[PDB]
Design a binder for this molecule. Sequence first.
Ligand SMILES: [Zn+2]
Lengths: 1202, 60, 32, 366
Amino acid sequence: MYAVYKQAHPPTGLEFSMYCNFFNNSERNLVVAGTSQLYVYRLNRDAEAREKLELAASFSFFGNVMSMASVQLAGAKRDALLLSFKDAKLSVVEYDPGTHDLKTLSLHYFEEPELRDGFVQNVHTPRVRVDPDGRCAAMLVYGTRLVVLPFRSSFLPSYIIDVRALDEKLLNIIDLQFLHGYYEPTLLILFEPNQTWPGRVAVRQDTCSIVAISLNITQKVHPVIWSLTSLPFDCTQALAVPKPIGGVVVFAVNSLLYLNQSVPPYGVALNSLTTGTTAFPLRTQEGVRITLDCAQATFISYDKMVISLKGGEIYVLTLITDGMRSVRAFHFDKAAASVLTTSMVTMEPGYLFLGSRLGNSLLLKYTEKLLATYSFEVCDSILNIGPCANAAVGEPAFLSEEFQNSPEPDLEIVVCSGHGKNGALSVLQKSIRPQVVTTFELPGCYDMWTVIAPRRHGFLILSREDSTMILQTGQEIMELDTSGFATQGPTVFAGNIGDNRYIVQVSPLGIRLLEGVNQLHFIPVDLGAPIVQCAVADPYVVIMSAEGHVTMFLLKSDHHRLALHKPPLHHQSKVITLCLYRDLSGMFTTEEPTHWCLLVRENGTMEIYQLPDWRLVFLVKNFPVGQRVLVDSSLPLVKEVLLVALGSRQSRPYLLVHVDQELLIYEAFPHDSQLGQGNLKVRFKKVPHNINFREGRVARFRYFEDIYGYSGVFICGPSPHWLLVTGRGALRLHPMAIDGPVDSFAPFHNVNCPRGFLYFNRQGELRISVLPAYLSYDAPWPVRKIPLRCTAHYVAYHVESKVYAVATSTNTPCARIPRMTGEEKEFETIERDERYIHPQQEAFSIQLISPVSWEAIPNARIELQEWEHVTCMKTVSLRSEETVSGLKGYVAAGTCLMQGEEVTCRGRILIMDVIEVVPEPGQPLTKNKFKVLYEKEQKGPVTALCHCNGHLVSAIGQKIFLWSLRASELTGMAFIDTQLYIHQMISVKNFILAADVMKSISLLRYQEESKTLSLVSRDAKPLEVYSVDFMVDNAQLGFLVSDRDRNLMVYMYLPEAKESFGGMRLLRRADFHVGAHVNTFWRTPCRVWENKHITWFATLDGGIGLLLPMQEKTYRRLLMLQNALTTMLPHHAGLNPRAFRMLHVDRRTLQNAVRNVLDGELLNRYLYLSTMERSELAKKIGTTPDIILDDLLETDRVTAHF
Amino acid sequence: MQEIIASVDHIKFDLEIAVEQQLGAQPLPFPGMDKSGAAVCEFFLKAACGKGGMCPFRHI
Amino acid sequence: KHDLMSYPMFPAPEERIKWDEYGEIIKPEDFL
Amino acid sequence: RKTIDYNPSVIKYLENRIWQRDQRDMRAIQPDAGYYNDLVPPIGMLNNPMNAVTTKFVRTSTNKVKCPVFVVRWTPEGRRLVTGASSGEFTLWNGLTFNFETILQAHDSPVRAMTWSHNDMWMLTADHGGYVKYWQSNMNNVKMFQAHKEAIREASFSPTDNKFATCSDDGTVRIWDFLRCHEERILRGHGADVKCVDWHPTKGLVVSGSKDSQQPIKFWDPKTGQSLATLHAHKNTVMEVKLNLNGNWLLTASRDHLCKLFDIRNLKEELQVFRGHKKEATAVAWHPVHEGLFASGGSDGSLLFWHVGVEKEVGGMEMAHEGMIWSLAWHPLGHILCSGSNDHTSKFWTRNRPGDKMRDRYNLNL
Ligand SMILES: [Zn+2]
């Protein structure tokens, strides 16, 4: 009944983009957005690994963005954003300095029942448009209201303009744009007064029109000027031509118009489909046969427009200008094709960003060729797990032999991402699994270091409780017994000084210098007590004893030699831990490398000193609490502190600290605060986690540089994680849960081992390990993107032979039309003009992908008929009397022929087996091959397929059959009559759960003694189901349903309840609203959680979520927290988390919402609060923070799969 | 795939318990009904079926 | 009303549907 | 053989759905005969409701006895159409290939009402004698009783399987219990013969039409029996009364050549009227997936299509369904429409195909 939603992978895929002064008026910024998440970019020119987009800020929302614009307000130092959320919500946000968050300036709530005009089912999205001059801003609420925001507080009170109360009775708004010049804000509006449909054009030829309303901000009056009424019927978006020419260009599907107030209407036709469907005067464009129906465009300078068509093809329109700035003709050219975009923005002049949902959103660069013709090259691309259609769970092929006897199953997910030309597969895999190439058994030793001796690592320095081991590395690693190092006792640190020219180890008595094996000299160090840890800079070595005494050593070139320099440090309290840091891309400017020291004291004060001197530069007075933003001012116990620079050329520093079995890490951002002379111009911002530290010093925070190119920090402990920042600048935390807890870590570059690492097992085992090279660790999950260049529909892992069967599709031009004369089919060849685009016919094929190398297996491809479309593919466990069990595990495909609505659609069931045969010499992958057993036409379209105890269950038409696989044929056993179109089925233990497109789910049941199939229960309410799952509890079995209104809901079959009939009605017991559509569903058991399963799913906007079932008592301790987190915390864009996660029925029926799912991304903000603020929310709901953290962190431990 | 990992053969669900002893199946009104397409009841073959003739399930 | 500005958050409007065997519990004042 | 198979349109919508997110992302169907696979059902194009303007002829479905049909209703699975005529027969026509399935003989009187419940279980069918017969989904005859002493004209059903209301020519609207077959109460004070009754989809209202000019539209209360409101809307003989599934709009046809909307939250004022019937407006059917549009049948045979917010008709033509149209029914997928004449035929109307020239006799007629 009770559950918790949790988000595993963020949504990838962009819908919105712009180019605005987000941080400051000095530079512009690419601010892109998508499904409920906002990304802000910079553009690096001198990037190591050529231009590259660098992430500057990432922002998450409790609501899906429906439009986005920007305007620079009067007296503002930045460029505010105008976000727009579903059913008439506006929010004006700026970037906030000081902190590093967003700041809401204005909130606008325009959803009242008198504005909906009686229409409950809203279709029209709110559309924010702003002025080119910044005078006002307009939102199209509900398609019949214009909200006008006046500009100069920075805002004037808004006023709603009724669209249908104007002249010309607008009533169906297509697109609306503000125009240039025209002294007052002028708003052009495309509309249709008498709407028609393409398909009914013989009685309504061309009905589109234009109103250029002129807004008076003060007087609140607005007259209609410059109306046209004879535009073609299929007019999509309009675009405002800039100021030196002025006017508007209007995209239609088959034509392109330039319209201006004084100029006569000019427009050309793009293909010969405006012959009998358009009476507007259109000329014929020369050498151009395309269409503009779903096309994005932007203006480069003035008179040049770049258009991204469907198919991804890029054209550049040139407005041929006369002497009086009047557009005379058009000019097209076919430039290089690109991704199927959803957005289009010019950056710095010479660049185009191309946002896309389906495909990798990439940045371009245009130069002129030597009229002007441009050439486009690709600079950077952003990785995109696309519109996840179907997704199968499988086992990877390269698990190392040391990790084979692990108790938990080792598995990954393969996702059908993208569409069309950008169709692909995505091999997602959450945790990092190393390749142990050489293991050891070295007990007793706990710490470890690798130094560079004459960039390969030369030595391996192992510290024991009484001695110290040395390993000479090279062609074959071998333990060293000669002089040099101190092996009579332990070592607390061992690293390089200078620039990889020396080796410095620290004993608890002193410090030795080393040119490799040869010891240079030795400096004993009493320093009160024995040395507990040391940190290293390039000339600096800073020592800390057990009683807080700090000394510093410095290289002086004499030949080099460490020199004692005692620091002047006013010890009002004892120093607990230390850290050193150098600048290589300096934001530590404090009003060429620069060295810095970090020093945590026992009173809770954190101090940064500029390291050549010892002056105090930065001071946080209450540090171990875990505040969100660290601000200078000049307990839980702080264990370990590490400052590290990560990214392109060591750009951005991070602060990683350890406070009472809790990891809390910080970013760093510049901040010019005029409140002193000698202070750092930086502040630190806490960033969220999924990592807990819940089970003479061992460092957990161990910085690595260049392990497989990637640089970052490995965080040791009971739950080891990889911290990674590449040149993207995006923070990446990847777990490593195999091989248990990890005690120590070191990078290790050798000959027999490539760029790689080296770590201790908890059982005392040294492991030479290399990261596996087929994944990309720059994405939020480690993923390999597999380009298919065709739309992947279904994927199914076949357990025998260990392969994937992928259903693909490519677009071919259609050439025939099926007819029906009563007895047989007749085909009419489409014979048209030469200036004619063809409709796209889809031809399907079934691939066979191998997990070893992810290429397709050659000569293994089932190709279907001409008009035949796979509607489902699942791995089907049919029964057989051959193996030791009953079940076999074939692959069945349900497919049928789409030939229009006047031809009877029939289907075919395609049952396939993958059998290992002998491979052809020269190709190792050709050992696998399909064997089609069953291929027979059915009596109607095959729309869903499943298995019940070895019986193939199929949905042909308005019936659901249940077949039995014989030696060669299927025999029918049972059937029922069902709903309109069963497009999904699932099954558990002779209980079928079907799903209709329009009506609802309907569970079935099959007795095996009597060959009968029976409807047990169903839902009578109408519901547009996408796909179905089973919520599995200890003894409860829920029926998880995803919907068209982005809703998750859980039905149960409860005959004891009175609000149903007697076993004849399904009763929903949980309601929830994910922000995206869901087609895929997975189950796996978790890592009190004795017999439950986790219903994983992948959203259709590119994310992955969870639903973890819980007890009733654990639900209600956290529901008291969720209501406290909703009200008592500020949210981005003023959005309400309760209002976003409630059910979104766009009707009214008798079904009051049963909310039994927690918001685990709202509950994830309780982990983000400081421990002073963490206890205030516990005292107000009558609990302690130890009880809540034993509930929020246990939902992260059992949900650490993949 | 979904049964090697998430095996549910060792779980006795309340769905499976509520369909064996029928757990509160109401008697069907209007006794001239057909119910051709419903479940077959195991109570008629083994034990006293009870509401014979006015049972929602068929009788073999 | 329309223009907003402990925290300035958007509201969460919800309405419970009181059932009955005839439909929804209705009042005789809103129909004259 | 001449079928309208809805299956290649639902498959196309299921394929688009994955990579679409709205209708503004949907690739435009172009008006040519080659773009026949690019069609979606009216669920697919949710705005642009001009899709579901069914002015394309499919088939006349005539019986062997040639009696006028009064009710036309689709099975809630969309599988078939049960059709009640003046001979008391139920002729069942298949919903993919409209040839013939079976014929019944339900009543000894002309059938006047036919309503399925909110689930696919039961079917109320009244007649001209005053008898109400329950029906299984496989057309099994279930308990019958006499609900009125005169000709019942319209039956409705509450938002549950528990209560229903009938109206007859004796001027009374009687509210019934479904399981007990028990007369709950009698709604009196109407004036003349009531001919149409629609229950509210959530609130538990009963709205009644009339022939009486002094009490033409009555709002009721099924629990108390009180006359709740009176709406002096039309001059004469309110024919049909329908309510949207959103619970806001009352739509009312009458013999004064008009159709009228009424927001039931504000009965003092009035929404737009629908002028364009040359003769009396007799039949009204709201569209299932498109709120705002409906279709309207006339007494001269006109079959017009309307939308909420559009002043003129969206479009149908006179001399379409010859005679006097008694009832209309949409398929659950709003891709096809059926009408019933006072003549002895029943015609099927589907959505127009891309790229056709409408020179048919139900069209521009060139
Ligand atoms: Zn029985």
